[PDB]
């Protein structure tokens, strides 16, 4: 049987989250720290995480609007630089790696002076402001948190959206089951997992796509809308 | 971060 939740495959939470913190703790704080490896993909990346959410800009009733977005499990701020601080007055970081938040303030130039706050927190303690963000953004760390974490989470981060705002989930996804990578301490979990858990935070998917144009060896990726 | 299929 394959596993469906990280109860089957963490061992010791505190252990889990822990060596989370000390592996990211060891890692440069470059883009290709951020990118395990893969820094050059990473324009790839953002031109396709720029279109998908252009299609939530368009003009209408529903459209979402451009006052602020957060970065989660931001790190040094690549998606911060590139993506979102073009397209939004102000944006906040968040992440657990203090090192990583202190490298974005030299990595992100004279734009990141509209980094409004930079919170140095794991998302699993991490309570955003309510009415707050237009796009909360959560990128290549979803595998850090827990099932019953990740929902809370996304739960908390349901109640920060401004009306017409949405949360974006880009990540890593297994073929099938809940996969343990004890190196980074991490899970890379199914399409069926990510959506249950999507379910059970009271949210909805607007939209779901493939990341086209990766090396054949990696984890398949996908970028969720929610509301 | 990306990362080859174990
Ligand atoms: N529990 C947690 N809470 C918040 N950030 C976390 C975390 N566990 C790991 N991280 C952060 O998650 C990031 C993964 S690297 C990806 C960085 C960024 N999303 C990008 O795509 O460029 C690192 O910056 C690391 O410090």
Redesign the pocket.
Known sequence: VPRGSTSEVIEDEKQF?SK??TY?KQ?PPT?D????GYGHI?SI?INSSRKFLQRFLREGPNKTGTSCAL?????????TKRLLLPLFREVDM????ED?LVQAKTYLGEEGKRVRNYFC??????TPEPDSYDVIW????IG??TDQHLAEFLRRCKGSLRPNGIIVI?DNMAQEGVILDDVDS?VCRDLDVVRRIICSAGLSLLAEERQENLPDEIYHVYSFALR | ?PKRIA
């Open positions: 989250y989370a913190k990211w890692i883009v720290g951020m990118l395990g990473s990346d970065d989660c499990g931001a790190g040094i701020g690549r998606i968040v992440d657990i790696t990583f927190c794991g998302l699993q303690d991490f959560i990128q290549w760390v850090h948190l880009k991490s | 971060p």
